[PDB]
Design a protein around this ligand. Structure first.
Ligand SMILES: N[C@@H](CC(=O)O)C(=O)O
Ligand SMILES: N[C@@H](CC(=O)O)C(=O)O
Ligand SMILES: N[C@@H](CC(=O)O)C(=O)O
Ligand SMILES: N[C@@H](CC(=O)O)C(=O)O
Lengths: 317, 318, 317, 321
């Protein structure tokens, strides 16, 4: 049987973030049928409260485990609120074909019809499966195999919370994986980024666009350290004429201006359509939602501050 | 006898070469005369991402004047898609008329291959002219659908199916005919407590985003710049970072309303007292309303009340 | 507390259709917090094997319970395969404002993260809520309140199985009901149909449309006693040139011809668009899928043989 | 001139309608003057039909035309204009039998070109743009409606009336915007150059028919369809390809008498039919159709049964394609 390590970080999957990883494992006795499992407690947090120091710590531990010939696959138990951020971060920085699965639950294990037991079983099943090798980071909730790149928490309350605009890649049913699509975007072994060479993360913040929005949050975020601002625009990353001149001033001051959107079910932000990105030296976030865009920007800016290069990266990952 | 419909033009891609005037929009759809007696007015000519509160009030006031007119049976507003959902919701809250009001845009300009605006505008006029539209609240007629102005949102970029509701389309409009499948459940228009005839200004309300490693910076700055309420676009069920909570408590104590929405917009809602102790902190949840929708309801509600209990009632009824 | 009766019919919700109704109720001890529950076993079937006599027996028993002063609400536990058919049938024939909720589960109770406990709790909650009165028949799976009219089993395996083209009407969360839409179509107390008058249903059958289809299934079904045929056409209820003449002959000879489709995520079939329905005296099924269209056709034909009236009905219900 | 050579094989449909199957291919091309900017476009009228009336003879004819053009050094990509009703069936058929890496795009429209805001102009432009793009090579058969790049394998007509008609349970693979292609997923199932099937070796298709499952269903349709020549039956079941107890005996007798029994469903937005779950497939020597809808399962079975009548081999095929 495969050797799978479970790194626990908290979340509702661990709600009485109360239960330790040994308790979570003990709650799924059937894990022993499909893998040789062992658990570590990396942290014990509510994921809405995650820090960049937590991401790096988790990232570095995943890398140490992926380097061990004693580990075949890795599962991370996590809160659902920022699961999608972690999953994408690991997809960019972990230079391994070994399976990495991120899993949570919408209901604590004490609730009626709690979803974590089966989610956790499926995460270990997928992490133990030869078919998962080289697929990038995966998320295994709602019987699905979702790409960590572009899966997002799209539905509140319901167990079907996690969706991608580009569909699930597969399903996991009675411990068996069934694949229907492969990834197209750069990940894990084919990434130019590596956690082994990342000691610090640049500060990236996010500001919302809406009717009657001002330049206030943009300026204030930059003044308090943002090296890049993700603009969560209306429509195709649209920017109000009131706010354009502030963003131009920010960019000249050296803040990357990355146009994302709050239009998150499909489509993407097209360069030079709604704003003159060439003239302004701005970047579009392609299909990536604001919080995903922030992750890619921050990892990218460990390597380059060149806005052309950042655009390439937003078109490749 | 054909319905008298007024088209209030505001700009948007439907008018792209916000370049074409209302008379040219109407001339572009000669089949309109088969379904209604149409006349056009240019209220403004903007890209909707650049709309101001002043612009939004001008539109609201003018809709009310035309609604009160005996020569008007329905009203169509042509509008940019970017903030169409915000305008539609605003009108839903403040226009105390049973006359149909339809807001419509397009994802492509009329110059484009397979442009969507012609049929969208025809469908808008058809719905505004239909007896079945009376008393249904503000409607949005894109993609052959009849969508509620309350909770339709621009959810898909690029594609003509851009506008979606978590609660589904209420109907369809096909070869000029309306087909209904659901009715509204939330308060609107004639059943609303709000009235644009009493509203000539709007309180400043702003939106701050939640994500990993977020700080209190944006919340503080928006309040320092005049925000009377903050919409929190949280992760998950309106969840708030432990590093933000203290600032939100400070701001609420200074009189700023704290309203928990989310960026989890395909379904579900934010539940009071679940992720945060709303009762203890005297905060409000935005129920199913996305952050921009939440901001429009908060700003309208705060013309009438600063009581967070009443605000919450309003978030549960509209 | 509301007096709720649970009428068990079988399904995976009763699997290990094995468990009796008293064991189902005992499996959710929390029901006693929210209603006074009593259970009856109406039948014990796999819903894929349901018959028209099963529908009548169930319907009649629901009508008897709705006429009782000691009953406030009724929950029917059911297999998921033909849940949508039963739900719709009851929507058409039960002339009561009392809540009627139909519920199943995708997983049996012995399974990891089984969905039946919470679905049954929610069903009782909804059946006990004054907000459910007058709403028609409801389906309460996946934390949703779905209309019995047009909810369908659209997704296999997953707990989100049940979807409507026109959206959920509400949600049920920690026992509380939250409404967002109301029904538009005729149902229950405002239906012209009543189960008290119906002794046996007309035989109606369904034939599929696809490339290189012939008239064989249509003729055989009619030969073996179909009084209407639901055409599950491609597209907008489209009919092959090789099939049209047979359907003209079958209509001439008194068989109703109802054009539905296997295009079931959205839209509707439009009269006179793909076929000359007025000339052929055929009927379109509007938005209704083939199995739902069958239910409506059977009920409708208990009142009328006039295709114009049948079309009215397909446009109102 | 460096522009890609793209041939449009017209077959009919609403894309060729007036307010179906009225306009010839020259009028289609002439209606998109911009095609000249992106490819060297030539046409051929293969047929002129409403696609709900397509035959197996029509499929073979089309397949063989596609094959010859794919073999031509003077053709870079192929576009088929088609009625939307059975577009999904043709697109999957070609994905199974065309042993080429050259782009093949199937396209239709929901509205005729005479209509307000007609969809066909842009759909055809996008089909040509995709058929001309190097990124399309090796991707299998594509469908390019609603600004999407969909897999011909598992895209289906799922929404009536609206221009977003075509959907896949597994998502769009890409989008096409201002003539440019943007990819987000790749195929996982066998297709085209990696298919074991080849139209060059198929002169005949075995007869396959489809019957529906629903309450109070009987064995009548299954028996009549087999009596009138069906070599396989696709069972369009409720739920997880579930079969009524009233029908099971009939399917066992048909199977014993040489008729393949293939369990699909009318549950088409997600999931799949799992072997041995609702019916003892092993014991009965039946096949499950996996995620494939009934009409898609019929195409696969038809093609598969040109090579094998071993139900174990047919199940392998339903799990690989
Ligand atoms: N707030 C929790 C929610 C969850 O896990 O469902 C977390 O993200 O830690
Ligand atoms: N930026 C435009 C987009 C559109 O109308 O589609 C607007 O909102 O005015
Ligand atoms: N075949 C079972 C499946 C289920 O209940 O989920 C039934 O319909 O009875
Ligand atoms: N019945 C037409 C429909 C269309 O093309 O949209 C066809 O399939 O030929």
């Amino acid at each position: 049987l495969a050797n799978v390590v479970i790194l626990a970080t908290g979340g509702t999957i661990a709600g009485a973030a109360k239960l330790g990883v040994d308790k979570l494992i003990a709650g799924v006795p059937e894990l022993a049928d499909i893998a040789n499992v062992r658990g570590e407690q990396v942290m014990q947090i509510a994921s809405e409260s995650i820090s960049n120091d937590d991401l790096l710590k988790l990232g570095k531990r995943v890398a140490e485990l992926a380097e061990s010939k004693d580990v075949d696959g890795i599962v991370i138990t996590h809160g659902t609120d920022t699961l999608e951020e972690t999953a994408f971060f690991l997809n960019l920085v972990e230079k391994t074909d070994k399976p990495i699965v991120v899993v949570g639950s919408m209901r604590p294990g004490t609730a009626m019809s709690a979803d974590g037991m089966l989610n956790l079983y499926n995460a270990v099943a997928v992490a133990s499966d030869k078919q998962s090798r080289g697929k990038g980071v995966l998320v295994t909730m709602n019987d699905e195999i979702q790409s960590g790149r572009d899966v997002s928490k799209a539905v509140n309350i319901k167990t079907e919370a996690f969706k991608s605009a580009w569909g699930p890649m597969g399903m996991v049913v009675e411990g068996k994986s069934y694949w229907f699509r492969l990834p197209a975007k750069r990940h894990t072994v084919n990434s130019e980024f590596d956690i082994k060479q990342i000691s610090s993360l640049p500060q990236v913040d996010i500001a919302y666009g809406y009717g009657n929005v001002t330049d206030t949050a943009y300026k204030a975020l930059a003044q308090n350290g943002a090296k890049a601002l993700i603009h969560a625009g209306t429509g195709n990353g649209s920017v109000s004429s009131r706010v354009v001149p502030a963003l131009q001033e920010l960019r000249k001051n050296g803040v990357q201006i990355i146009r994302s959107s709050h239009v998150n079910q499909g489509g993407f932000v097209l360069r030079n359509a709604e704003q003159p990105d060439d003239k302004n030296d701005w970047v579009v976030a392609h299909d990536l939602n604001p919080q995903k865009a922030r992750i890619l920007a921050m990892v990218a800016m460990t390597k380059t501050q060149d806005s052309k290069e950042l655009q390439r990266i937003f078109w490749e990952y």
